[PDB]
């Protein structure tokens, strides 16, 4: 919900074309009182409480809470026998059907989220094999998230990814108050 | 718009077993979009409703209403198609089972009342539906006699129970 922007919009009884004048004066005939066409009571009139402009749904949970969510999802994946850790993602052939057969034989599941590091040391074999599959999704470690881990049945990390995740998620504990954003030097913070 | 009366003549029955009633012929006909009021047409249809074909034509020939000649024409085409298409040997051996009028699609016009005021005039249209069955007209139901009245009163007396108890 934090990135959602809703572009739905209606016209109020002031943005609908026409309607300036008062039809059939107030007291004469036996009709109901009206001061404008384009009022919400009229066909073709404005909308009383419709959607207004592009609306944003932006909010932020505390980064400690979000890191806790990441740790919680990793814990659940391990506790439910859904986590697998590899030394490295490497395939002798590099074709999608090999990886699908391997997952089926190892009884992983239907949807597999493979996690690597830095997006640049991803080997050509797994890149080529996964770029064609639909339920096998290759992401770098920087892209790990609760929604993807819940959407995919199994999580497959590497050992460097495990160490990276451990360090990044542990840093949130035993850390000071910000005192200014962490994109600034912070002598011991890389 | 619905046209289902037209398709009632397309029904094909399986051949009857030799030892079976004759299954008299059944012919449906109609005229759509008649420039007439449907109530005015209903009166003529109600008059024609129970008669045989010849008696109905005779009655419609000497009625001085606009719809009388229209219904006469419809009945004549129905009789012709009954003899020609639906295998009715005797052209006079037909009676009217159903005869009714229905509302058609109408138009709206302005009436120009005697000020800057006005009314909406409706240009009325109607349909006429007829159905002919082969065979003599069924006899009219005789009025019930005092014997029948007494019989039903006695049966009403005999049917009563002791209510609100065992």
């Amino acid at each position: 919900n934090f990135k959602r922007i809703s572009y739905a919009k209606t016209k109020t009884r002031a943005e609908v074309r026409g309607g300036g004048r008062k039809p059939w004066p107030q007291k004469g005939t036996g009709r109901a009182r009206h001061g404008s066409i384009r009022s919400p009571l009229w066909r073709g009139g404005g909308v009383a409480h419709g959607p207004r402009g592009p609306t944003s749904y932006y909010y932020m949970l505390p980064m400690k809470v979000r890191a806790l969510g990441l740790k919680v999802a990793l814990t659940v994946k391990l506790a439910q026998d859904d986590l697998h850790i590899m030394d490295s993602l490497e395939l002798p052939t590099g074709d999608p059907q090999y990886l699908t057969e391997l997952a089926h034989y190892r009884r992983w599941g239907d949807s597999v989220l493979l996690v690597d590091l830095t997006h640049e040391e991803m080997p050509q074999s797994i890149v080529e094999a996964t770029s064609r599959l639909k339920t096998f999704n290759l992401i770098p470690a920087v892209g790990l998230n609760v929604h993807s881990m819940l959407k995919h049945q199994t999580l497959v990390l590497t050992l460097p990814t495990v160490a990276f995740l451990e360090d990044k998620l542990l840093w949130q504990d035993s850390r000071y108050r910000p005192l200014y954003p962490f994109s600034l030097p912070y002598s011991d913070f890389p | 718009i619905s046209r289902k009366w037209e398709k009632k003549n397309k029904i094909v029955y399986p051949p009857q077993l030799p030892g079976e009633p004759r299954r008299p012929a059944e012919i449906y006909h109609c005229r759509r979009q008649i420039k007439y009021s449907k109530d005015k047409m209903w009166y003529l249809a109600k008059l024609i409703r129970g008669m045989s074909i010849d008696q109905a034509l005779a009655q419609l020939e000497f009625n001085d209403k606009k719809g009388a000649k229209i219904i006469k024409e419809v009945l004549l085409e129905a009789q012709d198609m009954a003899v020609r298409d639906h295998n009715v040997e005797f052209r006079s051996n037909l009676y009217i089972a159903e005869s009714t009028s229905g509302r058609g699609q109408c138009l709206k016009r302005i009436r120009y009342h005697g000020r800057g005021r006005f009314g909406i005039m409706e240009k009325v249209y109607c349909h006429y539906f007829v159905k002919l069955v082969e065979g003599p007209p069924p006899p009219p139901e005789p009025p019930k006699t005092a014997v029948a009245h007494a019989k039903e009163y006695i049966q009403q007396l005999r049917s009563r129970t002791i209510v609100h108890t065992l």
Partner: peptide
Amino acid sequence: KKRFTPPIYQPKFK
């Protein structure tokens, strides 16, 4: 006073 309400003509297309 002389209170009069002029009649209203509906659109001719109806």
